[PDB]
Design a protein around this ligand. Structure first.
Ligand SMILES: Cc1cn([C@H]2C[C@H](N=[N+]=[N-])[C@@H](COP(=O)(O)OP(=O)(O)OP(=O)(O)O)O2)c(=O)[nH]c1=O
Lengths: 202, 202, 202, 202, 202, 202
């Protein structure tokens, strides 16, 4: 990553490397993996981002879908930012330089610490996150339409399932509630907060 | 977070990230989670606070109740602090900027390290804590009225249950004691400290 | 805590937070918990001390006895140090400011780094330790009078039990020894060191 | 490694040492070991690279194949960069100096921090990585031609196996799919992305 | 401890605290605990040394024997260094100040960072180590005279037991060897190294 | 160790201490322990080297063989570097000073940070490593002549055993291969690389 000493390059830590590999191993593509990715890659260069993605051993279908989204984003970058070199001067990054496949670490550092910065790390991160969100959505196993409260399922447990599903996938809460709770919730009227719904079906 | 070097931004550490996720996994919304949240988010920016909340994988009913409390606090902020920009100048934060959904990290840093500081991290933290306290109270499973000393339950064990319940929920200690201990405690008279009660029913 | 860079404030570390919670979980109020508390709270502000106490999830009988001892110490402080403010000047701490319930972190820092310092962290720590020692003594399960050497119990094992009990609770060693060892120890005469006693009953 | 303070030498950390040994123990020569090697050896001197390789206890067939590839790369270096010393001056590195077998740590440091640098650490790392890629390929147990979708195997599971194999080893995806999915995929037409294939056989 | 920034005081780390408690829990008073104690207390003040000793929960017979040895060493210090104060000046340490029971942390720091230093931490450490060596010797369960090679016990295993015993306790190696190995060893003649003995009875 | 701030002394870390003790516990004197020793003792003083050796609890036969090799190396040092003191001047180290048994930490530091340095830490380390290599060789359980490929043993598994043995101990690879693989390997002709042998007997 690049952090403050000046803005300097630091090696990615074993701690970070291991945190990410273990998140992926334990959580696969549950939606909460994405903010963890984002936070573990704070200050990442593109080289660091590729490290993190490359150190994942399974899920190679997902990793190939990700390469696809990256190549689409990189093609769109190049459409909007065609590149035209001057000895000792900073060249303009192309999509593949942002994605770290045709740029050196030194180039990456030169862009990211330029004044003003060309934040290649943050641009690449957004393309990766875009890819990862597609993957989360792909691997979401259940439609929110199939999350319905069981006859002895506590409302709270049902709400947990409901919003967990909506998170991966992205009135009905009441519609999908069991008969007894639905009756209570209908009687609460419109404008009830979630808190008030949950208290009423407790 | 922002800490002293100057007040500088530092990446959230894997240690912190993992500590918080593991607290939530092991303790759910026992009341002791709140001071742990507070201490793990020392110096947090709003971006860091969202990271911590976003990395929680379960409990999405609670996470949605929290969003509600945040949006109420943010609406009250905006009622009290309407915003009116000057090139290169610091804009005034709105509720959604404090909550980190419409402000950049750079803006956040600019507010929090301003002289005088606009402590958006601490303001957001208070809204989050307000939400989390509601959640603790919601998930408290037992009324203090139902904590009563068993006939062979050691007084100390009963007192532990009593104050654990009162903590989640927020004379009777004596009223709820078993017959034998209640007699002893009545004889102690008013003004007995807890220490003296516990020694008397040992 | 406040440590040297100047004396600066630093966030409490996840390491410290977790160490303390795990000590309490594994050791409850064995006497060795107290020096561990003391060492983990090195440089603590009152806010940090409250963090550490607040992050404990069980033992709420003990935590309430502790609040009592704190309020007594704070009432005695106020009796000895009544407080009489000048714009931009440092106010004098009251008991509740020392205990961190009515003082801000900034006030705490201002007292503790004043020249000369008003060491609110160290004063509060002593009140806490006073409370914790009462708790250790309360939860000590056995009178030293009931620690007696078993007929086949190795002397060393008996001495361990004896001094472990005396530590929680706070001639007889010989009196409480078994017949065979007592005879040997009586023959050693007065002035024997513990080492010499232990060697004689080996 | 050499990192920024100046570019200074730092001892390899126990954390790094243990991370690498544990990667190798758990993952052997799965392809994801290589980027982990690369990232754990960030800033490595040749001495550090030899440390990391030497601390591996098993896999000595692989370690000897690696020595072979290193000696070939070192022989090619010497062919392209023959060496011709001046008291107190920096000598030119030979292959065996790059590989750290005939150079001291001090020499290594002198090359790597020279202006301009003679990046012996990065040159050696590339030879090692070249060797490790041969080893990954050797130990790849399955031809991509033998990865075929089972009749009840979910497409996603089959794609994972397919790209995992291709990664170790380095139209057919459709050819190797089961009859039912192959029919769907043929109907999608050419130019389908992987995402669209995976959605169609879901 | 006191370490270099100036010589400054630093809080004892949770890492150190936990390392020591775990050594004692796992190893009791095997002789190898002593060098670990020494290395974990590098730069320790007397306050730190007391912390480390006080955080041990079991072994209170040993801890009381240690207090005895400390009080003897402290009495001998006072015999050799009687103390005779000048406002704002450094007083001379007595035994009990060296052992940290009557000296403050500030006094300790003032002695240890004086020019020239009065190394109270190192003096106390030597008294502690003296005590701990007595304890190691006390708890050594076996005389070296009872370590004899079994008829099918590998020589190496026997030598391990022999020198392990001698270490706790502090020609015969040959005398205590089994008949077959003793014959071989007698034939080797005098002046054989241990290496040569071990090779001969392999 | 001594590392860069100036070259300053730093305490050995609990991390290092524990890493070494655990390596020895898990790996005994497999050859890979030696490079781990070397890397964990980077910058070690002789005092640190003795710490590391002294903290090992088992293997006291090996530890005594090591003392022997050290005393031989130290006797050879003294033969080549006899010592002839000037108030406030640096004395010349004898073998026993290099091995840290008759030199103080301060002396050690004075030698190692002298300009030019008298690298007592590196000299002692080489004597230790010399000893440890003898120990590795002693405890190597099998002659390379007894490593022969089983009739259903995969060639790769056999090569692993072969080079693992050669490493502890320090044409035949083909001679010791099973009949079927030996035939293939004979047909490959001379000059085959290990890679080509392994591919041919796959
Ligand atoms: C002793 C022991 C530790 N662990 C883990 C628990 C801990 N997880 N986290 N932290 C690790 C210790 O690594 P940790 O102390 O976190 O080291 P690091 O992350 O490098 O931080 P620093 O060195 O303090 O700067 O080992 C275990 O799983 N089982 C065990 O028996």
């Amino acid at each position: 990553p690049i952090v403050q000493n000046q803005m300097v390059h630091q090696c990615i830590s074993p701690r970070t490397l291991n945190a990410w590999v273990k998140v992926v191993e334990e959580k696969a593509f549950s939606p909460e993996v994405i903010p963890m990715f984002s936070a573990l890659s704070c200050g990442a260069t593109p080289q660091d981002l590729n490290t993190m993605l490359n150190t994942v051993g399974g899920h190679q279908a997902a990793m190939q879908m990700l390469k696809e989204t990256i190549n689409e984003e990189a093609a769109e970058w190049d459409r909007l930012h065609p590149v035209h070199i001057a000895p000792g001067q900073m060249r303009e990054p192309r999509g593949s330089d942002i994605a770290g496949t045709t740029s050196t670490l030194q180039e990456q550092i030169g862009w990211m610490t330029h004044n003003p910065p060309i934040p290649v790390g943050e641009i690449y991160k957004r393309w990766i996150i875009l890819g990862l969100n597609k993957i989360v959505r792909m691997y979401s196993p259940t439609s929110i339409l199939d999350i319905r409260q069981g006859p002895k399922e506590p409302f709270r447990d049902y709400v947990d399932r409901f919003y967990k599903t909506l998170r991966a996938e992205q009135t009905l809460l009441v519609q999908n509630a069991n008969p007894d709770c639905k009756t209570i919730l209908k009687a609460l009227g419109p404008g009830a907060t979630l808190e008030e719904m949950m208290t009423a079906c407790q």
